[PDB]
Paper text:
One example is the secreted effector RomA, encoded by the gene lpp1683 in L. pneumophila strain Paris but present in all L. pneumophila genomes sequenced to date.
Although it contains three lysine residues in the sequence that could potentially enter the active site cleft, with the SAH cofactor at the bottom, it is clearly Lys14 that enters the active site in the context of this peptide. The peptide assumes a U-shape conformation with the arms following grooves on either side of a bulge created by a short, two-turn α-helix at the beginning of the post-SET segment (235–253aa). The N-terminal arm of the peptide, Thr3-Ala7, binds to the ankyrin repeat domain, and the C-terminal arm, Gly13-Arg17, interacts with the SET domain, inserting Lys14 into the active site for methylation. The Lys4 sidechain enters the groove between post-SET and ankyrin domains, H-bonds with Asp451 and the carbonyl of Asp448 (ankyrin domain), and stacks against Tyr236 (post-SET). Importantly, interactions of the five N-terminal residues with the ankyrin domain account for ~50% of the P1-LegAS4 contacts, suggesting that the ankyrin domain of LegAS4 is essential for the binding of the N-terminus of histone H3 and for subsequent lysine methylation.
Author numbering: 82 to 532
Amino acid sequence: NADEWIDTSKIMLDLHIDNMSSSDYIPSAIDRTDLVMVQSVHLLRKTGGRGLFAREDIPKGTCIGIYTGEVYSEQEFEQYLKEHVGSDKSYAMYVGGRVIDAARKGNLTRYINFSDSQDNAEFVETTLNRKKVAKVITTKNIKAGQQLLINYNTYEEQASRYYYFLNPGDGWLSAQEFYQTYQSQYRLEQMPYNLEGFDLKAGDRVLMTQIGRIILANYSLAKEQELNASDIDLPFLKVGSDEKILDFDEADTFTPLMAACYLGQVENVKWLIEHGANIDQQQSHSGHCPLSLTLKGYSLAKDTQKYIDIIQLLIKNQVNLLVHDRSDKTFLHNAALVLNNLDFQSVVKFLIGQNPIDINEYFTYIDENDFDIVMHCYNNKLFDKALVLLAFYPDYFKRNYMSDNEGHNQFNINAFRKAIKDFNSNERSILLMQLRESGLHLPEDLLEQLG
Ligand SMILES: Nc1ncnc2c1ncn2[C@@H]1O[C@H](CSCC[C@H](N)C(=O)O)[C@@H](O)[C@H]1O
Ligand SMILES: [K+]
């Protein structure tokens, strides 16, 4: 037997996997156990969650391994779920008409946690002994010690409503251990003003870096010499009433860039971005990021222009506009709600000017009500912003209602009808006027189906 030459006990000892029997670890020949390691994810400690981390720098496009597991046909797997109380699909990979369930048996790939806006790796179909399987390939350069994150390419309402928003920087250390490790970069300070956008009142104790203190004082980073860009994304660490640090799962931290965005410090935002701040960083519980926090600051401000400028900076630096809150609203969703008509138009114009490859990507994300951004505008009666979106992307109806996928087309017709179900005669005639506008070239039959 050839498996007698495979020592999975040593594989797991080398990877730091401590919650699998050796007879349940299923290696593949392309597994790069030299490049990765399994560790606890401190954020997930209350469920003993683990993750897969880079043991060294990994170049973009490197193969990590094969998603191994127990093999079922689709029918067999449904029968399994039906017969095994408490089993679920958390580890089930649907590929090639088969199901590869890594819930009980598998390899290192079973430890990669989820993100759809900060994934640095992806599942891709490959061939193995003439059958289709899933392999993991990095989609960005990974720095040693960062967690690998991957999009599961499925919808799970429980996921959007209960998962944490994981970052590549979320590791095995607690907030206490992180502070101890980098103590010389932190100083304890008292908040001198309220800051509801991060749930801080005047007088709260917070551990801050020099960069963070500069942001909170409203000083300019560019005027400072001897700034240590290493801790640019090291977080503000809140300190509890018992004078102990709040752990990562007890309170969201934030970065200097998050704060600069919320506060509208345009030049500081530019400086932070140019010095490598993760413009896609997300707070663990809330999901708030530079984009959402800029929108928040805009909602609470007399000077809205600096926030529009910050959104412009972010978009110029390839910020991920497909990030979404817990209701699966993307940035365009929520910006439709927060920005006035002129500013919403200006931001869509910025995005236009970045010349996105697939504009339709922005129009295929649906929120918890199954509304894409156009349906969303209409359901909130933002006729002007709906027209702005239609002018941005005239092909919207063509590509999402008259595609070659009749299932998708009908789902979208039904979702559009749902979005407008509460219109009165006046709103319906305004909508029909917009839709009959020459530029969309909507066929009469689709118009019938829409109203
Ligand atoms: N972003 C996230 N926040 C919280 N839990 C997550 C998560 N991403 C993945 N998970 C957990 O991990 C499961 C996928 S298997 C991923 C490995 C798992 N964390 C483990 O230690 O075995 C999900 O069903 C969910 O329970
Ligand atoms: K403010």
